[PDB]
Motif scaffolding. Structure first.
Motif, PDB file in Angstrom:
ATOM      1  N   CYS A 102       0.895  -1.093  -0.058  1.00 22.92           N
ATOM      2  CA  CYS A 102      -0.103  -0.045   0.073  1.00 22.92           C
ATOM      3  C   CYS A 102       1.034   1.401  -0.084  1.00 22.92           C
ATOM      4  CB  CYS A 102      -0.871  -0.040   1.276  1.00 22.92           C
ATOM      5  SG  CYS A 102      -2.312   1.195   1.089  1.00 22.92           S
ATOM      6  N   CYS A 105       0.560   3.716   4.084  1.00 20.32           N
ATOM      7  CA  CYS A 105      -0.677   4.404   3.924  1.00 20.32           C
ATOM      8  C   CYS A 105      -0.899   5.091   5.147  1.00 20.32           C
ATOM      9  CB  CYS A 105      -1.943   3.707   3.595  1.00 20.32           C
ATOM     10  SG  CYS A 105      -3.284   4.478   2.543  1.00 20.32           S
ATOM     11  N   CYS A 123      -7.958   3.583  -2.106  1.00 19.25           N
ATOM     12  CA  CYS A 123      -6.732   4.120  -2.222  1.00 19.25           C
ATOM     13  C   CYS A 123      -6.143   4.226  -3.653  1.00 19.25           C
ATOM     14  CB  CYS A 123      -5.658   3.075  -1.699  1.00 19.25           C
ATOM     15  SG  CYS A 123      -5.301   2.950   0.239  1.00 19.25           S
ATOM     16  N   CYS A 126      -2.652   6.445  -3.534  1.00 16.75           N
ATOM     17  CA  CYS A 126      -1.439   5.215  -3.649  1.00 16.75           C
ATOM     18  C   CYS A 126      -1.625   4.129  -4.294  1.00 16.75           C
ATOM     19  CB  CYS A 126      -1.094   5.189  -2.225  1.00 16.75           C
ATOM     20  SG  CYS A 126      -2.076   4.145  -1.025  1.00 16.75           S
TER      21      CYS A 126
HETATM   22 ZN   LIG Z   1      -3.347   3.323   0.631  1.00 19.42          ZN
END
Ligand SMILES: [Zn+2]
Length: 135
Positions: A102, A105, A123, A126
């Motif tokens: 991720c 995050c 998300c 990202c």
């Molecule tokens: Zn994220």
């Protein structure tokens, strides 16, 4: 802080939610084994949690893809179908290794949303994440 976790076992098993704290369910190694056409789950407890906090869901998923009989073989949990550490590793690796995947995050300067108690979220910034429904 990754391998040698600091699991105090505080209300993370039989101990009722009496004691207030954060339940961090994350531990290395969380995938099954491909044996011909069956999955030999050994850590159904840990593998299940990360792959799906709720056991009812995780279980409904193994059968949903299991085109074969589908049952617990051996002494651990050797199912038979299409759960050849496919969906299992994917989902687990998503949470357990959500940092490197991720992209940490932490404080994203975007609109993030999480629903299902750390189970689903978006998300678009990202990368991409699954919220829940498609509007
Ligand atoms: Zn994220």
């Amino acid at each position: 802080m990754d391998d040698y976790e600091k699991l105090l076992e505080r209300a993370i098993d039989q101990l009722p939610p009496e004691v207030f704290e954060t339940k961090r369910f994350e531990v290395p190694k969380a995938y099954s084994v491909i044996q011909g056409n069956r999955t030999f789950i050994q850590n159904f407890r840990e593998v299940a949690d990360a792959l799906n906090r709720d056991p009812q869901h995780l279980l409904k998923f193994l059968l949903r893809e299991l085109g074969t009989a589908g049952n617990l073989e051996g002494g651990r949990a050797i199912l038979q179908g299409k759960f050849t550490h496919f969906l299992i590793n994917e989902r687990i690796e998503d949470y357990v290794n959500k940092f490197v995947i991720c992209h940490e995050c932490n404080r994203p300067d975007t609109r993030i949303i999480r629903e299902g108690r750390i189970s689903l979220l978006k998300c678009e910034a990202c990368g991409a994440k699954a919220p829940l429904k498609n509007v």
